[PDB]
């Protein structure tokens, strides 16, 4: 098992597409839901200064796999083949 963390909000379809991808491939994940604008911007600013992201984030979903920042849904799909090797 690889360790997957996804940061999301409700009413974000790209967050659902990301989760659905993991689910359709039987990959478990831990979801953190941050619905309010205040909580999300604090999370963005925190991550953007944490050293852990590979670009400055300002949307959800944000996906991390084994502690490596992958990105949003576009990035997930771009790496679909490699992630399914893990
Ligand atoms: N240029 C991308 C388009 C992104 C997209 O297709 N939707 C976003 C949801 S706001 C996403 O998570 N897709 C992949 C990504 O942005 O990295 C962006 O910054 O939003
Ligand atoms: C602009 As948003 C909170 O759907 O990533």
UniProtKB/TrEMBL annotation:
GO function term, MF aspect, one: protein-disulfide reductase activity
Superkingdom: Bacteria
Keyword terms of this UniProt record: Disulfide bond, Electron transport, Redox-active center, Transport
Keyword set includes Cell inner membrane: no
Residue sites binding glutathione per the record: 49, 67
InterPro entries: Glutaredoxin (IPR002109), Glutaredoxin_subgr (IPR014025), Glutathione_S-Trfase_N (IPR004045), GRX_bact (IPR011900), Thioredoxin-like_sf (IPR036249)
SUPFAM superfamilies associated with the record: Thioredoxin-like
PANTHER family per the UniProt record, alphabetical: GLUTAREDOXIN-2, MITOCHONDRIAL, PTHR46679
Protein name (Swiss-Prot/TrEMBL): Glutaredoxin 1
């Amino acid at each position: 098992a690889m360790k997957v963390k996804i940061y999301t909000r409700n009413g974000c379809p790209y967050c659902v597409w990301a989760k659905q991808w993991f689910e359709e491939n039987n990959i478990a994940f831990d979801e953190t839901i941050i619905d309010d604008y205040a909580q999300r911007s604090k999370f963005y600013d925190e991550m953007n200064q944490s050293g852990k992201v590979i670009f400055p984030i300002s949307t959800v979903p944000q996906i991390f796999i084994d502690d490596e920042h992958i990105g949003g849904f576009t990035e997930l799909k771009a790496n679909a083949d490699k992630i399914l090797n893990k």
